[PDB]
DNA sequence: CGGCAGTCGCCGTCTACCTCTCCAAGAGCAGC
RNA sequence: CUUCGGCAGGAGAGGUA
DNA sequence: GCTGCTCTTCTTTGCCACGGCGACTGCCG
């Protein structure tokens, strides 16, 4: 398997992060098998399948609301049932208030569970919306779900072979002229960084 | 201190009613440390005569 | 140092040739990279 | 609760194997540590006489252990005579990455 | 007690004001997390340490 | 967004000569 | 004209100008 | 079950100046 020369990665300044515009901490994470990186993306399928994707997501999303209100209602029912048994009057309403609050709390945690679910699904969505080359993903679950459901038409890896693939597509002329333009016009620390 | 680790480890490997004090002690680290100190050290020096 | 390099290269090669899970080959690749780095410049990163 | 990978020494896979057991009895971990199967290959060493067929480790250096969670487990299994550490540092190791939901059977079968 | 005994110099009382720490639990956990970044924050192993 | 200041990591630290000693071990695996 | 056959790395300590 | 040959090195305690220069990186404003 490929490896990396230590002189061009651990030096000061790092001659690999100066070429790929990556922070040396990200290089240390990628090379030593600690974080994934996005090697290449393609916006063709992305733009030509937005509606479709969104709709499919919404379709799965609706199931959550379904289950949510199913348990919600079933709870409410059984709760009011036991309220008719021993909470309509002062039979044992003392701790029966706490009893019905039991299922009210379980309905509050049902809403918290719909939160959790819709939240992580929102994460997945916002992730697949951006997907740009040379972006690090540190959490393994997010990348695993992304590559399971939206694996095709997108590539990622980790290690020195990923650095090799990143260098393969690197266009020298475009970056050189962008740096020269930033040097010519535009002030601040960007001048020093571009130099 | 080095030999104590082996002594402690040997209690989870042998069997009770067969454990004997002459079977838990390894005297090799002690002699190795003594020989390493008395030779090849910065404070035990060749005598001036 | 050359001995360590050759050892972990033949280990990685055999693990790959048999078809081991991804985590084992990733650990082996990490170890091989560290060994090569130690060969070229010992002590730059981590302990010597 | 699932399966986990453990790093040993080159020349101590079956000593670790035996140790984990003896220690599971000499401490009191019969409600935590479970089966410990080191992947083996019974590749018949044909000899027509004195047979030299052996374990011939398929993954020299690794031993598969089915354990529980917590930290006591960890300590007992890691501080065994012949192990080097764990396998799964794909991000801090906070949640030691387990073997993919369906991967155990692909080794246990053979 | 800390403000009764360690309160004869404005150094101590001013460091006490900007402390932001209240509760041996919070404190202990703050230091536990501090010592080793990204680690299991079990209070058992905190009191252990 | 935009400065920004502490902090840490890597570089360097005179020339020539003489005498002596010391340099892994532990555990597993043979072919008889 | 002479056949084979025969060597020299590190570490530490103490001194001289 | 003999002794010579052969192979291999990660939890657990060890760890121990001073000036100059430049990158950098959270961090406050």
Give the closest residue to D84 by CA, choosing from D69, D62, D55.
D62
Query: How many residues are present in chain C?
Result: 48
Q: Are D84 and D1 in contact (CB under 8 A)?
A: no
Interface A:D, Cβ pairs < 8 A: 11
Q: Can you tell me the distance from the alpha carbon of A15 to that of A170, in angstroms, rounded to the nearest whole number? A: 15
Written as six digits, the tokens of C7 are 């050892």
A13 upstream amide cis, omega within 30 of 0: yes
Q: Can you tell me the distance from the alpha carbon of A72 to that of A77, in angstroms, rounded to the nearest whole number? A: 9
The helix-helix angle for A93-130 and A140-149 (nearest 10°) equals 70
Q: Are D41 and D58 in contact (CB under 8 A)?
A: yes
Q: Are D86 and D4 in contact (CB under 8 A)?
A: yes
Q: Are A139 and D91 in contact (CB under 8 A)?
A: yes
- Residue in this structure with the two tokens 């909470």, named with its chain if needed: A87
Radius of gyration of chain A (CA): 27
Distance D11 CA to G8 C1' (A): 39
Distance B45 CA to F15 C1' (A): 28
Q: Can you tell me the distance from the alpha carbon of A133 to that of A154, in angstroms, rounded to the nearest whole number? A: 10
Q: Are A155 and A29 in contact (CB under 8 A)?
A: no
For chain A, say whether C45 makes contact (Cβ under 8 Å). yes
Residue A52 has φ and ψ, to the nearest 5°, of -45, -55
The answer to whether the CB atoms of E38 and D71 lie below 8 A apart is no
For chain A, say whether C29 makes contact (Cβ under 8 Å). yes
Q: How was this structure determined?
A: cryo-EM
Q: Is A touching C (3+ C-beta pairs, cut-off 8 A)?
A: yes
Give the closest residue to A141 by CA, choosing from C3, D65, D98, C40.
D98
Radius of gyration of chain B (CA): 17
User: Which residue range forms the structural domain that includes residue D97?
Assistant: 1-110
Q: Are D22 and B12 in contact (CB under 8 A)?
A: yes
Q: Can you tell me the distance from the alpha carbon of D89 to that of D79, in angstroms, rounded to the nearest whole number? A: 19
Calculate the alpha carbon distances from D47 to D42, D50, D51, D53, D57 in Å: 14, 6, 6, 9, 20
State how many domains chain D has: 1
The answer to whether the CB atoms of A35 and D91 lie below 8 A apart is yes
Q: Give the H/E segment covering residue A154.
A: strand A154-157
Q: Are D23 and D80 in contact (CB under 8 A)?
A: yes
Burial D63-88 (b: 16+ CB within 10 A, else e): bbbebeeeeebeebbeebbbbeebbb
Query: How many residues are present in chain E?
Result: 49
Calculate the alpha carbon distances from C12 to A100, A113, A148 in Å: 62, 44, 27
- Quick one: how far is CA A134 from the chain centroid? 15
Q: Which of residues 73-92 of D touch A (CB under 8 A)?
A: 89-91
Q: Are D98 and D2 in contact (CB under 8 A)?
A: yes
Give the closest residue to A164 by CA, choosing from A52, A30, A12.
A30
Q: Can you tell me the distance from the alpha carbon of A96 to that of A76, in angstroms, rounded to the nearest whole number? A: 15
Give the closest residue to A10 by CA, choosing from C6, C38, C9.
C38
Give the closest residue to A64 by CA, choosing from A134, A14, A130, A116.
A116
The answer to whether the CB atoms of A140 and D91 lie below 8 A apart is yes
Q: Can you tell me the distance from the alpha carbon of A57 to that of A115, in angstroms, rounded to the nearest whole number? A: 16
- Chain E hits for D92, CB-CB cut-off 8 Å, are 38
Calculate the alpha carbon distances from E48 to B4, B26, E14, E25, E43 in Å: 23, 31, 31, 14, 8
The answer to whether the CB atoms of D99 and C23 lie below 8 A apart is yes
Nucleotide nearest to D12 (CA to C1'): F28
Q: Can you tell me the distance from the alpha carbon of A104 to that of A79, in angstroms, rounded to the nearest whole number? A: 8
* Burial bucket for residue A98 (CB in 10 Å: 0-12, 13-18, 19+): exposed
């Amino acid at each position: 398997a490929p490896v990396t020369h230590i002189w061009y990665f651990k030096g000061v300044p790092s001659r690999l992060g100066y070429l790929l515009d990556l922070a040396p901490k990200d290089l240390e994470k990628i090379i030593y098998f600690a974080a994934y990186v996005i090697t290449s993306v393609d916006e063709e399928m992305r733009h030509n399948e937005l509606s479709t994707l969104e709709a499919e997501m919404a379709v799965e999303r609706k199931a959550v609301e379904d289950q949510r209100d199913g348990e919600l209602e079933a709870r409410a029912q059984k709760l009011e049932a036991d309220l008719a048994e021993l909470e309509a009057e002062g039979a044992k309403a003392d701790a029966r208030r706490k009893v019905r609050d039991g299922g009210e709390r379980e309905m509050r945690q049902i809403r918290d569970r719909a939160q959790r679910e819709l939240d992580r699904l929102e994460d997945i969505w916002s992730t697949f919306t951006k997907l740009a080359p040379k972006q690090l993903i540190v959490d393994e679950n997010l990348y695993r779900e992304l590559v399971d459901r939206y694996g095709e038409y997108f590539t990622g890896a980790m290690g020195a072979e990923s650095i090799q693939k990143l260098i393969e597509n690197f266009d020298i002329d475009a970056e050189a002229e962008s740096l020269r333009d930033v040097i010519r016009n535009g002030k601040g620390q960007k001048k020093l960084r571009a130099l | 201190s080095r030999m104590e680790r082996v002594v402690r480890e040997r209690m989870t490997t042998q069997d009770v009613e067969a454990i004997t004090p002459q079977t838990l002690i390894n005297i090799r680290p002690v002699v190795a440390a003594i020989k390493e100190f008395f030779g090849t050290s910065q404070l035990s020096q060749f005598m001036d005569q | 140092l050359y001995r360590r390099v050759i050892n972990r290269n033949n280990r990685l090669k055999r693990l790959i040739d048999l078809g081991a899970p991804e985590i084992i080959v990733n650990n082996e690749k990490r170890m091989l990279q560290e060994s090569v780095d130690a060969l070229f410049d010992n002590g730059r990163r981590g302990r010597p | 609760k699932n399966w986990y990978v453990v790093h040993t020494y080159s020349g101590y896979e079956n000593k670790v194997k035996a140790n984990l057991e003896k220690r599971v009895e000499s401490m009191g971990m019969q409600d935590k540590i479970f089966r410990v199967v080191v992947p083996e290959e019974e590749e018949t060493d044909i000899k027509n006489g004195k047979k030299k067929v052996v374990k011939k480790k398929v993954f020299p250096g690794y031993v598969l252990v089915e354990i529980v969670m917590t930290d006591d487990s960890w300590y007992v299994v890691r501080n065994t005579p012949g192990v080097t550490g764990f396998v799964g540092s794909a991000g801090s190791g906070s949640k030691p990455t387990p073997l993919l939901p369906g991967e155990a059977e692909t080794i246990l079968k053979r | 007690q800390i403000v009764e005994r360690f309160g004869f110099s404005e150094i101590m009382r001013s460091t006490l004001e900007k402390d932001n720490t209240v509760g041996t639990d919070e404190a202990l956990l703050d230091i536990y997390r501090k010592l080793r970044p990204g680690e299991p924050p079990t209070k058992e192993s905190a009191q252990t340490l």
